[PDB]
Each structure stands twice: as structure tokens, then as C-alpha cells.
Amino acid sequence: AIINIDQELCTGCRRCAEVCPVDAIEGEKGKPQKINTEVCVMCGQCVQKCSSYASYFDESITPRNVKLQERGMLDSVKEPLFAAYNLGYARQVKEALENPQLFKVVQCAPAIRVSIAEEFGLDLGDLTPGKLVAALRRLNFDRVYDTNFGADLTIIEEANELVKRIKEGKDLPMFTSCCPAWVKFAEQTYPELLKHISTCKSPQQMTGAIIKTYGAKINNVDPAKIFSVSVMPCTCKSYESDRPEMRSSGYKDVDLVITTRELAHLMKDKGIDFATLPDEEFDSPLGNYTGAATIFGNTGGVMEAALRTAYELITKKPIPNIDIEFVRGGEGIRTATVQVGELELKIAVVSGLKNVIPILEDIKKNKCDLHFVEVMTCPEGCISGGGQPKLLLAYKKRKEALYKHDAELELRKSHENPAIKKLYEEFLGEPLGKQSHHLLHTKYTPRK
Amino acid sequence: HVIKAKERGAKLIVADPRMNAMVHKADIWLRVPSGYNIPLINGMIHIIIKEGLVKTDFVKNHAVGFEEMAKAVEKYTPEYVEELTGIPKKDLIKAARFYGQAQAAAILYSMGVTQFSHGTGNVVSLANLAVITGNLGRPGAGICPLRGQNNVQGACDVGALPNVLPGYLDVTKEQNRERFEKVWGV
Amino acid sequence: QEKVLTTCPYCGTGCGLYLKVENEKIVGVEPDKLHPVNQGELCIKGYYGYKYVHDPRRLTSPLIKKNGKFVPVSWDEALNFIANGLKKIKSEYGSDAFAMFCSARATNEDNYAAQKFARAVIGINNVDHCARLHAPTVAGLAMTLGSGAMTNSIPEISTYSDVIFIIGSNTAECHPLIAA
């Protein structure tokens, strides 16, 4: 299991039942509940809504030392333990770090650099890339990479996929493939529409696949001892990283993921302070990205990132489409119209998972034709995922910081990155070029 | 035993010129100066007579008279003893209410009244109060004196006074004198 | 569950009454729709006089007084004591040693048996009941009309309109169905 509910601490307040879209929480108005783990999409918002915290000044419960073994957390955290607990993977990361025979690489998501700063008494939403990378290299990690490389890769792949699908339209209302809880829900309840969803992999999986077979070629390390851990703000990528069909080049692309809170626990356990450390830069070969890949943490940023190159793919003329403010919001479903290549596209972006059900019907899809739809299960995007820290009960600071980081960089379109050009001219050739179908494409066939 | 009887249903009425551990645990403290308990008990009898709480069956069936004590207690009024003793007057009414409507009442007294010159009147008045309330010959009610030594009672059943013989018999009677003359010895 | 026809014993009118019994204990009482006297409705004592038969204080064993206190004692030796007491008093002073107080709230067979077993066993005319205190009425009516009891029948007083003359009116709270 991943999401559980302790029966010694749950009080039956039913609050967490009012936020998960699947309603997998079964119980009464009182008494402890239980998670229907066979239908849960692992979104994580039932964790952050929990507020039972039973202290250790009484001996009527477990002695709080064996509890840190069940939850999988570190033994030197001394933070309050809640009821709706995530499963912990920090101990296995620590044991892998103890072994000096593993060429260790780590990945950074475009929502950790803003989230981690609140874990050491700083301002909420302080953009700290340099401190994060310096601390990561001080955590005995041999290499640090950014998952935004795979974000640029999946932007190019999805743009080419949309250009291919706009000609001789076959299941044209295609959906984005960046939120694995959305894929799990679509395979759970609406199995007949799974071919609509694009066959492009999540950015972490492309990054891991490139690390395992291309990162082992630019270096002198065999692709058998590499230990890859991705830091994702999500109680959602662990299920994504252990599917039977989610491996390439023989081995797993991503071994096991850790959220922001587990990274903070590892940071505190090693006894390294955060404010004193200076700034540093990521590794050049697989850490150079653009601002279009930076806005995926916020909701709807995939749309600008895809359009900034889809416009050039369709019209073949460079005309500015850097910024749009009509698709940026925080709730419900948002719609827009785009005129490109003497073609009109009706675009929608959905924050949440329930708010796809009105536009997923076989009758409603025919009446709107939904030329491109972007979906995020967690509200307001991955900046409000399960990996983000508790808030003792805000969101706008993180998204404003991400947009400021996008506006600060001198590279905006996700096409001018020299690393992507070098990768295409050396290893992959052309997109959809009988090589990406083995490394960057998946077939969504659980048929659940 | 007295304080263990306070099973949320007992009523303690204590009268004491001094201060001890018993008066601090009683709801009613009828503190009276020494030697002024005779007007207090006379007013007690007067109040319980005036309220009409007298069990007439016992006095009619066993006692020889009722008006004899009424002739002596009607002289003393609650106000008369109020300025005679300097104590609140509502306390007497409350004590009468607690003593009268109850079924069993036990009266105790320590060495303080026994070592008094005029204790005969005190014990006679206490006996009269016990008779008039009908709380004699019943379990949990009656006059309950206390003895200051272990074997005083066994020094009364046998001869230990110059006017008594073993068996609660008086030596002034010649019949008891001739009752034991040879079995006793000389 | 089971219904038994009985006559209500609380007053002298007499009414049909179904003793609705269940698990051997009375659970209710019902009126008889075909009875000619009450016509299917009863007073307070008929409807709620069944809560008198199973009180927790019902006398459940014979007791005798030996030294001033009653003691639970079986039937046969108590009958021995009664028999020898009656025998000795009859031997001493004859058959006038007792006066029989037969109940007015018992069936006619009880009174007949009491009379016979006070007259055909020891033999005396000392039988009485506590319902004499209407005694001049039976004497007067016998001396006037030769009839010692009721003349007419109750349900005929309401079949058709008559003139009803009441002497010493307490029928409204002595027989709550005749006044009905």
C-alpha cells in the first residue's frame, strides 16, 4: 500500500472524504475509515487535510518508536505524526547512499526548488536553485540533474504528436500524459477512451531513460550500477515508477521516488544547515533547460510550453506567442480559442479530476470536439500535490515564483536549447523516428 | 463510626463550648457557653412541642404525664435563650427540623458534662428529650452515654460502691443481705 | 393469545369479560360485544382490575403462629392443628365455639360448602356475611310483596323510554354501568 489510515489515530471527521475525487474512503460518520486501495488514484489530498496528531505523553498507543518503522520514515525526525500517512522511502535512499559502489544520480522537479525553502524557517516561496543543488551535492549524491530536460523532450514529442494527429484526425480530442493519477483514473473507470490520451511519457521517465542509456555513454559507467532517485512533489510518482511496462534498457529508469518532506528529513538527519550553503549550477550535459519547462508546476503551463513550438511547427513562421494570460487560473475548467495555420482550436485546461467527468462523456465530447485538453488531478497543479509540506490548517507565492523564474531566463521557447539539438543530432535522429517509440513512448494497456 | 455514617444521608448536630475536630465537620454548630445547656435543651423541648412533632402514642402508652414537662419548657422561649446564650435563632429551628422529621436519633456526650456539678439536671433533661421524641427502644436511636474507663460498667454490675451489691442490688435492703450469707462465706 | 370468558367480580352488576392471557399471565381484558348487560364496554375496575392477581406480595405458602411469629409450614400439619383445635373446643364447650364469616366476594359454591361444612360436620347455625350492612330491604320486601330480591331486569330499562325514579342517588359512582 501507499496511502493508509491508522486506526489508532483516526477519529472519523470525514474531512478527507470531501476532497478526493474517487471517493475511495469508506466508513461512517464516526469510527476510523479505510482506503479502498484498489480504486485510489494516489492523489494525496487526503493526507494534507488530516489533523489527528496523537502525542506521545500517553502509553495507551504504540510507543512512537515502532511507528517510525511502519511509516518508513527516518528515526531522527521528531516531527508530529498524523493519521493519514504516506509511505516512506527515505531509509532505502540512506542505505543506498551508504554503499560507495553505486554511481548515484538524483533528479530535481520544477516544484522542489520553491517548496523546500519553507522547511528551514524561510519565507514561503523563496526561489532557491543554488542552495538546493549545493545541498544535494553535499548529500553524497555524485550527480544532480533536472527533470526539465525530459520536460523539453516531452514538449517537443507532444507538439510533433499533435501536428501528426491534426492531419487526418483520428480520435482528435487527445489528452496530456503528464499526471499519472489521471491515467490511473481513466484506466479505472473509462477504459474505452484510453487511446485518446497521448503515448508520450512523463518527464521523469524520459529523464531516467536518457540517464540509463545515454548518460552511461557520455560517461564511463556501465548501465548496471546506476542508482537514480527522483525528487517529486507528489504522492503519485511511486506508482508511476514501478509499472511492469515502465522500464527500458533492461532496468528500471527510476528506482524509487521521495517527496519534499522526505528530502527535508534527510537534510536534517545529515546535520547540514540550509541558509549557510552557497549557490551552484547543475551538470551541463543533462541539466540545461529553458523557461518553458519551468512552468509545469503551475496549472496550464504545459499549454504555453507546447504552443510556443506547435505554432512554429504549424505556421513555419516565427511570430511571438511567448505569453498568454487567458488560460491562467486556479479552479474549475478554463477555455480558450487559438487561431493557428488557418486552423481554429478550442482549448480547455482542467484543474482537478472531477471536472473532467462533464467533458469526458461520449455525447459532450462530440458537441465540443475539445481539440486539446490538459489535465491535473491535484488542484492548482502539482504545486499543491501530496509532496508539498503541511500548512497547519499560500499557494500563490509558489506559482508567482515559478512565473518570475520563467520571465527571468533569456530562453523562452522550448526549441532553442542546445542540449536538445545535440541529443537529436547524436542519439535519437528525428522525433517519431523508430527510436523514440522504444524509449519515449508507452502503450496504455492495463485495460482495467 | 459517626463520620462513616455520613453516607450522604446523615445529619450531625453538635453543641460544644470549645472547638474540636467534630464541630468542623458538622453543618450545624450550636456553640453554647458552659453551664447554659439547660436553657438550650429547655428551648429545644419547647420548640419541638410548639411545632407539634410529638409522638403522642409512646407518651400515652408508657409515660405517666405530658403536661409536667410542658409546664417547665413553655417558660423558656427561642428568643429567651437567644439573648440568654447569644446564638442565632434560626439554627434552633433548623436543628428541630432535622431532629423531628427523622426516625432515629442518637445522643452522645463526652466527659465534659459528666465532670460538671449540675450534671444530674443535664442527664435528666436529656432523658426527657429522648422520651418525648419516641426514639427509645429502637435500633439506631436512644441515649448513648460514654464511659471514661475500660471497666466502669463492670464496676457497677458488681459491688464497687458503698450502696450496691453484685447484680444491681442495694445493700440497704435486708432481703439482698440475707440472700447471700452462707454461699458468700462469712 | 388466549381469551377466557369471565364475570367481573368488582361490583354486583356482572359483566362479560375476556381475560386476554399470554405466557400464563394476564396481559389484558376485553369486553363482550354480545353480552346483554354491558353491551361491550366496562368501567374502571373491569378495564384495570387485572393488576391485582400477580403482585409480588401474594401469599404463596401456609404459615402458622407458634411463638408469636409466623413460620412457613406445609399443609398437612396445619390441617392437623386445625382438626385437633376444633375437636378439643367441641369436646369442651360444644358446637357453638365458632361463627362462620363467609365472604361476599366468593362464588356460590364457596358459601354452600362453608355452610355444609359448618352444619353437616360440627353443626351450628352460626354463619354470617359482611354484606348485611341492605338487611332491612329483604325483610321489608318479603313482608310486603313476598319477594326477597330484584323484581325486574336491568337491560329492559333502556329498551324503551320509561320514568326513572332514583332514591338516594349514588348510582353514578357505585354502579357505573346501570347509570349508563
Partner: protein
């Protein structure tokens, strides 16, 4: 509107059967064992008096805890929330509310029955809405003095009296 019960004093013997039935039905149901129908003696006639279900109540307007409320077609006391503030006893014109106290019973046959058989709150005629049969008082009466009046029986009686008056005035003299 509301359903209630009325007793014409022509056929009431004062036999105390309706009062005892009303007490004992409520006792065996699980509510207060006290009767909610009071027998009153006057200079000319004896009539039982109960709660004529007032359509404005003058009762729910004085209850501070809001215990008295209209349910179905009757006024219900809701004994569980009643606290004992003797305010509805002031505002009842006919005096149809008494309180569950042993001393509230007058000396009669019913008192003897209830003492040979064996919370303080305001009890009122609830019209026996919990019982599938009709009211117990109207059903156990030896002379059928009480009678239950509905919303439609009032209209029928009004129409009958009105038609009789009109026909008599027409027939005799215009």
C-alpha cells in the same frame, strides 16, 4: 385544521374510566404515567377538560427552549427538551397542562389504583398519535361522551346547521 376531542356534559357519569385509560396507555407506551384529561366539578354539571388544540397555541410562543411544536395535526410537547419553566401554565386559558408530580393527583379511585399498583415535566394531551387505534379516551368511555372532531367534521356540522336554518326560515315564514 387541527384535530381535537370534545365531551358534551350530557352523558358523562364521572366514572374515571377515560382518565385511567389515558394514564395507563401512556404508562405502558413508555411516557409519563400521568393522565392528560382533567375531571372538573362545578355548580351545574361535570365535564372533562383537555387540550383543545389551539391553532396559534399560546404555548409555543412562551416556551424558551422551543419544546412545544405542531406535528401532524396536533400540538406536541416533546417532553425530552422540556425543562420545567412553569410559563405555559400561565398562558393556557383552559388550564390543559399539569406537571408530572405525585401531589398533582386528586383523591379518587384512580389514586387508589395507582397506589395499590406500585423526572418532573409538563404533560399535555398528544391525541395518542403513536397508537394505530384512535384516542384511548374516546374509545374506553362507557357512555361514549367524548368524540373526536376532525377538519372535515367541523365543515359538515357547519353546513348542516346552516342548511337547517335556511330551510326552516324558508318553510315557516320568509
Amino acid at each position: 385544521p387541527n384535530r381535537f376531542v370534545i365531551a358534551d356534559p350530557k352523558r358523562c357519569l364521572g366514572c374515571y374510566t377515560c382518565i385511567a385509560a389515558c394514564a395507563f396507555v401512556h404508562e405502558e407506551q413508555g411516557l409519563q404515567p400521568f393522565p392528560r384529561l382533567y375531571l372538573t366539578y362545578t355548580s351545574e354539571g361535570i365535564m372533562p377538560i383537555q387540550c383543545r388544540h389551539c391553532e396559534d397555541a399560546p404555548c409555543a410562543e412562551v416556551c424558551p427552549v422551543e419544546a412545544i411544536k405542531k406535528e401532524g395535526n396536533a400540538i406536541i410537547i416533546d417532553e425530552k427538551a422540556c425543562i420545567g419553566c412553569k410559563t405555559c401554565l400561565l398562558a393556557c386559558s383552559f388550564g390543559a397542562i399539569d406537571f408530572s408530580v405525585q401531589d398533582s393527583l386528586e383523591q379518587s379511585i384512580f389514586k387508589d389504583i395507582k397506589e395499590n399498583l406500585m423526572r418532573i415535566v409538563a404533560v399535555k394531551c398528544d391525541l395518542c398519535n403513536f397508537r394505530e387505534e384512535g384516542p384511548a379516551c374516546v374509545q374506553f368511555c362507557p357512555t361514549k361522551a367524548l368524540k373526536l372532531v376532525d377538519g372535515d367534521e367541523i365543515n359538515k356540522m357547519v353546513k348542516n346547521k346552516r342548511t337547517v336554518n335556511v330551510e326552516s326560515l324558508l318553510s315557516v315564514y320568509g
